[PDB]
Design a protein around this ligand. Structure first.
Ligand SMILES: CC(C)Sc1nc2ncnc(N)c2[nH]1
Ligand SMILES: CC(C)Sc1nc2ncnc(N)c2[nH]1
Lengths: 190, 193
């Protein structure tokens, strides 16, 4: 009922904002894409930013699912190779035009830095801490505090993706950034 | 004329002090005018609104952050580019740990300036110094030849997240010790020297 309306609105908002950006699409156009009235939409979402918060949750769930599948697919043989594949998986997924627009460009603006940090960490800290713990257990990464390392790596990878997202030559930005991240990772791994 | 130049400096000083202590959201422009000893009319002549005064406060705070980083690196006695990078990382944790810098740069500025605004300021102050330390290390053979701007950007993201993690940690003393250790391991893995 309400759940059907909310799911229609989130789907339509993800599609249209994914293509043209948060700033360029109003709630009435999203209501039309979804097949609901303005009244029904206003009942479910106070304002545009509330609908965007639910869009970011569903997109982040999909980002983390896709990254897990690419890492499972990579044929990584050790925890060190799992971390290298996880970095390749992030650059691949964050290079999706919808992810670029909603997560890398719009979410930091609409959510704020604190908001974006909270979402990024809520979705990514667990996977990141896991990869670090497995590398430490396999003797391929120095025993060190896991959470601070995970935090710093997430900040590095988020900034890498945002640099590529806004680069004048994104093809070259991506190749050069991937080399930077490999050197950084490889200096930690043994 | 001289009265107005004095008023502008008094407002920036008083706003920096009070917002530094209690946060942007907790201090209004009337209290800042009173602190500075000027009328609301004199404050309104200098600053269209509260956020315009905050933008000028961020500029003098950022100038002092970058000056203090340069001072702490000069004071380290670093003799090589590699040792200057190690000193610069320790200097950022020290400077970003100043309670006024924490409150105005790490907490208030992203909110008041917005994302685009805050990133533009952060880059204007930090990218130059960072790229210079990287170029010197590459020239000295202490860092592999590579494109400078992508490395600078990734390291700035790492260092910004380190500072924000300490700023909001349950135990900031421990967060800072542990973050300093992981950043030292990270740069020592990349530096030939
Ligand atoms: C996969 C991780 C090693 S890196 C990462 N950064 C992120 N930022 C925003 N949303 C996410 N899901 C992120 N994941
Ligand atoms: C230059 C390096 C220590 S990293 C750095 N990130 C920053 N963010 C905001 N304002 C600054 N001055 C910053 N410096």
């Amino acid at each position: 009922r309400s759940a059907a309306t909310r799911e229609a609105l989130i789907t339509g908002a993800r599609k249209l904002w994914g293509l043209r950006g948060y700033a360029e699409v109003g709630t009435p156009e999203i209501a039309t894409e979804a097949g609901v009235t303005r009244g029904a939409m206003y009942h479910q979402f106070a304002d545009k930013a509330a609908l965007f918060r639910d869009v970011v949750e569903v997109v982040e769930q999909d980002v983390m699912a896709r990254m897990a599948t690419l890492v499972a697919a990579s044929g990584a043989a050790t925890p060190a190779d799992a971390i290298r594949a996880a970095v390749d998986a992030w650059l691949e997924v964050s290079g999706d035009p919808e992810v670029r627009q909603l997560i890398l460009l719009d979410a930091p603006v609409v959510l704020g830095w604190a908001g974006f940090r909270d979402v990024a960490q809520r979705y990514s800290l667990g996977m990141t801490e896991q990869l670090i713990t497995e590398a430490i257990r396999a003797g391929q990464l120095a025993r060190q505090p896991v959470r601070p390392l995970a935090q710093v790596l997430i900040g590095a990878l988020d900034e890498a993706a945002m640099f590529i997202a806004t680069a004048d030559d994104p093809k070259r930005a991506r190749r050069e950034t991937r080399q930077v991240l490999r050197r950084l990772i490889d200096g930690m791994l043994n």
